[PDB]
């Protein structure tokens, strides 16, 4: 069954900072993947929107004109196929195609623990590259002015795990850095649409639940009656019998948006630099949002068994307004509930816009959020 748990809003430029909405705006409800926006705030506060993950390669020539390479990982939470293909392209451009020994430490997170990363490296990294995925990437890379090799290839004899604590660079080794795109791009990719991986790895990298509870307490004077998190993504930790969802109040979601916007603003950024724009970000869950929301609304969606959710900002003739809509669903019993709830949320948000003099388009051009950019080229440290 579909019904509203709580909706709330607040004008961004509100002097009084009074959060308007229903009498349930102070009750905890399941958030689903709007949790990713809270994770965004934390990452933005702890690292900065321009932060970059600096993966290091320790590169030593070997007897036969080959190289040994050790990857000192940065826990970059967006190091998958795409970033791997870029790495391979970069090794080629540096004329590294013969690798005797490839080793990696525990901070080298690779999702296409040591046992599994070794397997993905052997299975995927060192194997043949997909022309399908590669050319698509290369052509995307070109759109943001990043150069990649044609038919890059790598040959790796041996792959193995070597703990950070137990690694010593040879004195004949050269240290190279492969920087991620800035965090804001990573967060944009995450918030457009993602499985749990990026969000959950950010949340863990920042210290997990203990550190989160400490952060939100300091930041917002929030206790567990306001917000209770178990992961970064909002996905169920328990079972369909015993579900465990991140929950928080609708007011807390408004405070999160307020604080996120303030921290981004201090570096010249807007919510649209880390969250999806209705009808403009086509690779996002809001790519087909129509009506008064199209071009005016920056937002994150969520869906889980018991909830359909949306939060973000609307740009109206009366100004920027933060909003959060938390709907109840019973997707277990009626899979149709998500679609029913999704349109009711849309209509509520459209009504909020109507009541504030109608929409006003934001300044935004659709971004292409790859895990690397033009500063990600392998470079000597």
């Amino acid at each position: 069954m579909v019904y509203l748990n709580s909706m709330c809003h607040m004008a961004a430029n509100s002097k009084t900072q009074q959060i308007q909405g229903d009498d349930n705006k102070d009750d905890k409800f399941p958030l689903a993947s709007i949790s990713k926006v809270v994770t965004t705030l934390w990452a933005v506060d702890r690292l900065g929107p321009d932060y970059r993950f600096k993966t290091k390669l320790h590169v030593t020539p070997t007897a036969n004109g080959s190289y040994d390479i050790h990857i000192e990982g940065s826990r970059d939470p967006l190091f998958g196929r795409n970033m791997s293909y870029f790495l391979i392209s970069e090794l080629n451009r540096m004329k590294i195609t013969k690798i005797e020994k490839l080793t990696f430490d525990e901070n080298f997170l690779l999702a296409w623990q040591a046992s599994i990363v070794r397997a993905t490296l052997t299975s995927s990294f060192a194997t043949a590259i997909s022309p399908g995925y590669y050319t698509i990437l290369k052509t995307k890379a070109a759109r943001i002015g990043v150069q990649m090799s044609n038919r890059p290839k790598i040959d790796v004899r041996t792959i193995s795990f070597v703990k950070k604590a137990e690694f010593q660079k040879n004195e004949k080794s050269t240290t190279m850095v492969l920087m991620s795109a800035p965090l804001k791009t990573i967060l944009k990719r995450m918030n457009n649409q993602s499985n749990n991986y990026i969000a959950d790895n950010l949340y863990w990298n920042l210290g997990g639940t203990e550190a989160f509870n400490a952060y939100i307490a300091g930041k917002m004077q929030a206790d567990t009656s306001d917000i209770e998190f178990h992961n970064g993504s909002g996905n169920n930790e328990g079972s369909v019998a015993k579900p465990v969802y991140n929950e928080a109040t609708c007011e807390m979601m408004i405070k999160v948006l307020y604080s996120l916007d303030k921290s981004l603003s201090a570096k010249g950024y807007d919510l649209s630099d880390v969250m999806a724009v209705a009808a403009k970000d086509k690779a996002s869950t809001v790519g087909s949002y129509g009506g008064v929301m199209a071009g005016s609304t920056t937002a994150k969606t969520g869906s889980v068994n018991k909830a359909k959710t949306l939060m973000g900002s609307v740009s109206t003739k009366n100004g920027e307004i933060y909003f959060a809509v938390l709907m109840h669903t019973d997707y277990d019993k009626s899979r149709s509930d998500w679609g029913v709830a999704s349109q009711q949320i849309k209509n509520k948000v459209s009504q909020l816009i109507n009541q504030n003099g109608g929409p006003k388009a934001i300044k935004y051009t659709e971004q292409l959020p790859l895990p690397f950019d033009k500063y990600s080229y392998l470079t000597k440290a």
């Binding site: 087909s288 009506g291 899979r335 509930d337 998500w338 679609g339 029913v340 459209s350 109608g358």
Partner: protein
């Protein structure tokens, strides 16, 4: 045959290989519906998983089965914003003259029209009359857009043949509902259209 919980979960989550493992083994009737009336195809559609949809279509599954909310795979695709999948299903011959879940009985056309113009056009190319097919409350897409849309959405609908004079079951015009919903811009536009 029997439905598989594992196949249905795989299809929703977007795990192509697991879907292929369970299907090709052929222990599973692909048209069998589970406890809430779901098929593998409805699961794939709902999750926006185009490759799984294509795989299932190559097995010639029935497109028109309905879950307990009365929804076909195409209604799942439209209502969950999987408009890539929706276009695939429409090209594969999925019936467009269907109702999506909820009390209003909105038509598929009306839901697409509020969100994805391309798909709304693809629906009308199959059945041009849907432009004016009313839901349970006697409301067309014009009404929904009058409430929650833009003058450009209204122009879109008029270009596809929207009747301006229709009245819902309460005796309201689309202009009436625009005003009731405080949508200044659509009320303005609707007052002026001839």
């Amino acid at each position: 045959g029997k439905s598989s919980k594992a196949l249905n979960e795989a299809a929703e989550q977007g795990d192509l290989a697991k879907v292929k493992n369970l299907v090709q083994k052929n222990k599973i009737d692909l048209n069998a519906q589970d406890e809430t009336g779901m098929t593998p195809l409805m699961n794939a559609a709902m999750g926006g998983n185009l490759d799984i949809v294509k795989f299932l279509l190559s097995k010639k599954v029935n497109l028109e089965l309905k879950n307990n909310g009365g929804e076909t795979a195409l209604a799942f695709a439209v209502t969950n914003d999987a408009y890539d999948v929706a276009e695939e299903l429409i090209k594969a011959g999925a019936n467009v003259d269907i109702i999506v879940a909820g009390d209003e009985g909105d038509t598929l056309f009306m839901r697409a029209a509020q969100n994805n113009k391309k798909t709304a056009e693809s629906i009308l190319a199959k059945n041009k009359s849907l432009i004016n097919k009313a839901n349970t409350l006697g409301e067309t897409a014009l009404f929904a857009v009058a409430r929650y849309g833009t003058p450009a959405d209204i122009d879109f609908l008029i270009k596809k043949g929207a009747d301006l004079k229709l009245k819902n079951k309460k005796g309201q015009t689309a202009l009436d509902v625009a005003k009731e919903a405080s949508n200044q811009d659509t009320a303005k536009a609707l007052s002026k259209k001839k």
